[PDB]
C-alpha cells in the first residue's frame, strides 16, 4: 500500500497546486467579484480593499490572518466565531499533543522489529505486506514491551490536553454569547414565546380567545397579541411557494389563487389547533415566560424561547407531544438501521482497499487480473472516492429525518443532524475500516496458526494498516476540498455560465450570485469525522496527527477567507452549537480511550488497567462541565432582556415579522 | 454450598417466625402504643381503631392491604406514596417476568447435563462441587445449545416488561405530584427564591440594599424582603445547638451567650456574602423567578426554587460556584477510591464463602482445620453478615460526602447519596461476588487444562455458583430485616428502657418515642442492591426471581404498616425521587443486558448479537423518557402558583419561617 499512499498524496498535491494557482488568477479579475468577493458587495463595502494595485499575490492570507475576532463577529455573526473557535481548539489540541507524542513515539516505533519477527513466520515469502507501517505503534512494537509505557503515558498527554482546551473553550464561547446578546437590537424574537401544545378550546370558545385569556390571566399586563393560524395550512405553504414561482416566471393565476384560498379556509374551518406565538410586551416578561413551565403534567402548554422568524419551521409547529414521541422513536430506529447498511458499504470500501490481500483469497481467482499499474490506482483513488460519495448522501437524509421529528427551529434541527451524523460516522467509519482491514489480513493467516499467543499480534498488525489507509483519506480530503473551496471553481463555472446563457434579468444574476451559509450541517459533521479518526489513531499510529494538524489548520486559513469574503450567514443562534460540539469532542476522547485500552492490551501490556482511570475522568468531566455551562447556552437571561431599550420597541412591526408569508 | 443454603434459609425462617410472633403479642399491649402505633398518636387519631376487642390477630394486614392510595398520601405524604409506587412497580416487573421465565427456564435447565459432562473432566473425584446448581442456566446448559434460544428470548421478556412498567409508572407518579401540588396550602416555600451566588456589593453599598435593588428592578412590584445574614454564621449554628442542649439539661450560660454574640457579629462585620432567600409577594412571581436564568455567564445570581424551611441546609448555602465545582470533582474521585477499597473487602467476602475451594490451595492448608460442622456455619452466616456490615457504613459516609459538595436541600442530598450508593453497589457487589467466585474455582482448575475450549465453560460454572450465594443473601436480608422492622424490637427495647431507667420528664418520653422518617437514604439505596442482583441473575440463574418477589412483596406489606402506623414524614418533595429511581431501574436493565450478552456468548451462542439490539433500545428509552417527563419533576408550574389563594397569603409569617433559629 505504500506505493498507493505515495500516489494519492502526490496526486492531491498536484490538484491543490493547480486549483490554488487558479484562485490567485481568477480572483484578480474584477468581473469575478460576484463569486470570489461577495459579502462585501451585498453589504456594500466595495468588492475588495481600495482597488489600487492587484493585491500582492498573498493578500487573502494577510486579511484572514489579521482579521479580528470581533471583526468576524460584527461582519458575519456569533456563529461563525464559534465555528472558528471549534477549528482553533481542535487545532491546538492536535498541535501540542503532536509535538510531544510525535517526537517521542516516532523515534520509539522504528527502533524495534516486531514486524520483522512477525515476518519470520509469514507463511511463504510474503513480500510488501508492510513498509512505512514500521513507524507507528504498530505491528513493530514487541508484545511485552517496556516501550509501550510511552504509548500509555501518551494517552494521558492527549487526554489532559483535551481537557484543558475544552474547558478554556466553553468559557470563551460563553463570553462571546453574552457579549453579543448584551449588544444587539430590538429583534422580532426577543418578544415572543411559541406555545406548541395547547389544549382544545372549551365550550364554543374561539381558539384565539382561549389562548388569549389563559396568558392574559397569568400575565395581566403583558400579552399583546397571538398569531395562531397554522399559517394558512402547509398546503398553502406550497401554494405560496408556487405563487413565488409564478412571479419569478413573470420576471394558471386565477384558478391557482382559488385553490389556495379554498384549501386554506376549509382546513381552518374547524380548528387551527395548537401553535401560537404569543407576542409579549416588554422583553423581561417574554424572557421569564420562556423559561417557565406553564403547566404541570407536561403535555399541555409547552413554551419555548421562540425561534427568530427566519427559522420558525412553521411546518412542524403543530404536532402534539404524543406524536412527537412516536416520531422520535421511529426516527432513532431508522438511523440505527441506516448505520447497519452503511457498515455493509464501508466493509466494501476497506475491501477494495487491500488489493493484494483481497485477491489472495476472498475472490481468489476472480481478481487475478490485478497487475501492478491498475493495482496502484484502484487502491489510491477508488477506495477513498467511495467513502466520500457514501458519506455525502448522509447529511441530507439526516436533516430530513431530524426535521421530521418535530423540532421547531432550523438551528436545533441542524444540530440534530450533526448528532446523528456523529453517531453514524464514529461507529461506521472507524469500526468498519479498522476491523475489516484487520479481519481480511488476519483471516487467511489465522486459519493456519492456532493457539492465541500469535492471533492478537496479527490483529494489531492489521489495525495499524487500516491506519495508513485513513491517513491517505484525510489527506485527499483536505487537499482537494480546500482547493475547491478557495477556488470556488464549481460555483464560478455555474455563475459565469448562467450570466452568459441563462440570465434574463439583472435580478436573475443577483439571485445566482447569492453565496449561502457556511453550511453548518456538512462542515461540522464532516470535520467531526476527521476529529475522530485523528483522535483514535493518534497513538496507535502517530502520523495521523501530522496530517491532522494540516486539515484543521488549513481550516482557519481557508475558511476565514471564506467567511469575511463570501458566505453571508443565514440564521443566528448566538453560539448555541458549542454545547453540541463539546460533547462530541469529548466523546472522541472517550472512544480513543476505549480503543487505547483495547489495543494496549492486545499487545500484552498487563498494566493496561491504568487507562481505566482515564475512562472515568472523561465521564466525570462531562457531567461537571454540563452543569456549569450548558445552562447559559439555553436561555436568554433576564439581565439581557432588561437592558435599555432607547427607542420604544415598536410592536405591531414585531407582530408583522412572524406573519407567515 | 447446598448444605449451607439450607441452613441460612432455614435459620432465617426461624428468626422471622420468632420475631413476627413477638409482634403479634407485644402490639396488643396498649402500653406499647408509643412504639408500635405512633403517627396515630402524634396526629391525634387514637392509638388504633376503636379499642373494642384485641384486634383479630391478622389486623395489621387488613389495614395495610386496604389502605387507600390517597389515604397514604393524606396521612403521610406524597413521598411515601412514591416509595410505595417504587416497591410496587418493581414487584410487578418481577412478578410477570417470573411467571413466564421461571416456568420455562427451570424446566429447561435440569433437562440437560453440562454439569455432568464437566464432571467427566473433574480431575480427581471432585465431590459436592455443585448440587441444586443444576437448576439455573448454569453450568448445566451445554455450550452450543439449541436450548439457549429460550434464555435469550427471556432477556426480551424481562426487558419489554421493564419498559411497560417504568413508563406506566412515570406517568402515575407525575399525576400524583401535580394533584398534590394543586391541593396544598400557603406554605412558606411557595413564596421564596434562594439566590446563592451573588456578586459583591459595589462601592460602599450594604449587601442587603445591593440585592434589594437588583431584584426590585427586574420585578418592580414583587420583591418584599430578603433574608441574607449567613444565619449568624455556622459557629453560631453550633452555639445555638449548644443552647438547645442547655435548655434540655434544664428540663456556662452567660459566657456562652457572650461567645455566640461575639463570633456572630465579628464574622458578619465584613460581609454576609451570598445566599439570600428573596421572598416574593404573589406565588406566580416567585415561581417565574425560580425557573429563570437571572444572569448570563452563569456564575452570578443562581436562583433555585427555594427548599422548604426544614431542609434549607443553611450550612452550605454560601459556596461560590468555583468552590462548588472543585468540591464536586474531589468528592467524585473519593467515591471512586472507596469503590476500589470495597472491591477489596467484597473479594474477602466471596472468598470466605467457597470454603472447600478456598482451602483447596489458596491459603495452602492453613485452613485444613475446616471439618464439616464449622464449615457449614462459617459459610451460612459469616459471609452474609460481612456484606451487611460493610454496606451499612456506606449510607452515612455517602450522605456526608454529598452534603459536602454544596447541594442545598436535604432532599437532593439524600438523592445524591442514593446515587453514589447505586454506583458503589452495582459495581462492587455484583462484579465482585460474581468474578471472585468464578476466579477462585477456575484458578486451580485452569492451571492444568489449557486451550480455551474448556475455560469458558468453567467460568460459567462459577458465575452460577456466585448466583446461589447472592440468593441466600437476599433471603437472609428479607427475612430478618422485615422481621425486625415489624417488631420494632430494637426500638421497643430502647424506649421501654428509657421510660424505666432514664426518663426524667414526660417531655423526655415524648422525645424518646418520636418515630422518624422512612429513611429514604437507606431504604432506597439498599433496595436497589436487591433490584440489581435480582435483575442480573434473573436469567443466568432463574431462582433469584422467586426470592426477589418475596423481598419487594413483603415490602408493600411490612412497610405499609410502617407508614400508616409509625414513621411520620420529615420533609416533603412532592414526588421528586422518581426521576432518580427510574434512571437506576433502567440502569439495571442495562447492566443485566450487558451481562446477558456476555454470558450468552461464553456459553457459545453465536447468535448472541441479538442482545445488542436491546442494549440500544434501553439507551433510547432513557433519552425519550427524560425528555417527556423530567421537566415536570423539576419546577412548580405557573398554573399551580395561580390557584385561588382564598386567605390572603400572610407574608411576614412566611418571612419568619425561614428565620434561622
Residue numbers in the entry:
A (entry chain A), B (entry chain B): 2 to 252, 287 to 696
Reproduce, without paraphrasing, sentences from the article in which this PDB structure was first reported.
Mechanosensitive (MS) ion channels are a ubiquitous type of molecular force sensor sensing forces from the surrounding bilayer. Here we determine the structures of plant and mammalian OSCA/TMEM63 proteins, allowing us to identify essential elements for mechanotransduction and propose roles for putative bound lipids in OSCA/TMEM63 mechanosensation. Briefly, the central cavity created by the dimer interface couples each subunit and modulates dimeric OSCA/TMEM63 channel mechanosensitivity through the modulating lipids while the cytosolic side of the pore is gated by a plug lipid that prevents the ion permeation.
Inspired by the observation of the extended state of AtOSCA1.1 channels in the nanodisc, we attempted to solve the high-resolution structure of another member of the OSCA/TMEM63 channel family, the higher pressure activated mechanosensitive atOSCA3.1 channel which exhibits a half activation pressure threshold that is much higher than that of AtOSCA1.1. We analyzed each monomer of AtOSCA3.1 in the two states and found that the single monomer of the contracted state superimposes with the extended state. Therefore, the major conformational change occurs in the central cavity. In the contracted state, each subunit of the M5 and M6 linker forms another dimer interface through an L487 interaction. Therefore, the area of the central cavity is reduced compared to the extended state. The disruption of the M5 and M6 linker interaction and extension of the central cavity is likely an energy barrier for channel transition to the extended state and then opening of the channel.
